[PDB]
Write a protein that binds this ligand. Structure first.
Ligand SMILES: Nc1ncnc2c1ncn2[C@@H]1O[C@H](COP(=O)(O)OP(=O)(O)OP(=O)(O)O)[C@@H](O)[C@H]1O
Ligand SMILES: Nc1ncnc2c1ncn2[C@@H]1O[C@H](COP(=O)(O)OP(=O)(O)OP(=O)(O)O)[C@@H](O)[C@H]1O
Ligand SMILES: [Mg+2]
Ligand SMILES: [Mg+2]
Ligand SMILES: [Mg+2]
Ligand SMILES: [Mg+2]
Lengths: 73, 73
């Protein structure tokens, strides 16, 4: 149940072999994340600083709880 | 006249201040470039390897001579 990476459209658009496993293509941990209870301003600041469209939200143990996107804002 | 960087939509979409100079927002050199006379297959291989959409083409002296894009293929 541990968050070991994230795979988005950019990674997959440049790959031709569709049979390849996700572990070979994904952006591996550590990721840019935030804790549960992160404010909207802080989340958008983290998104804009690291020039990424997605921000996973994790609990105290690091297991994934949610996801915040720039598209929603 | 030296190629010192590149500034694309990903760099400009995450900057809130429009009065900032290019030098602060651009991706700085060294960039991913190819020589003059590079084949189409090599250019597409570089583009898909480095997960970028733009490939400057330079001469022997490093001057900017052209640009190849994935959108063209
Ligand atoms: N929270 C994150 N931490 C680390 N890397 C991330 C994170 N979110 C996305 N990435 C990586 O950033 C890169 C850019 O993907 P991003 O999610 O910003 O756009 P996209 O939706 O894939 O592409 P498009 O520009 O076509 O909309 C990808 O390689 C992705 O794996
Ligand atoms: N040839 C290159 N060498 C190095 N970095 C590059 C190069 N081309 C673009 N970049 C950088 O990589 C990121 C993505 O640029 P790219 O040109 O691939 O897409 P984009 O047109 O900005 O994105 P989108 O179409 O998703 O809005 C940007 O931060 C940009 O500055
Ligand atoms: Mg996207
Ligand atoms: Mg997008
Ligand atoms: Mg573009
Ligand atoms: Mg694009």
């Amino acid at each position: 149940g541990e968050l070991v990476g994230i795979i988005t459209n950019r990674d997959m658009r440049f790959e031709v072999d569709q049979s390849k496993p996700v572990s070979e293509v994904m952006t591996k941990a550590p990721l840019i994340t935030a804790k549960e209870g992160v404010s909207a301003e802080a989340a958008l600041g983290l998104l804009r600083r690291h020039k990424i469209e997605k921000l996973p939200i994790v609990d105290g143990h690091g297991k994934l709880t949610g996801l915040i996107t720039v598209k929603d804002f």
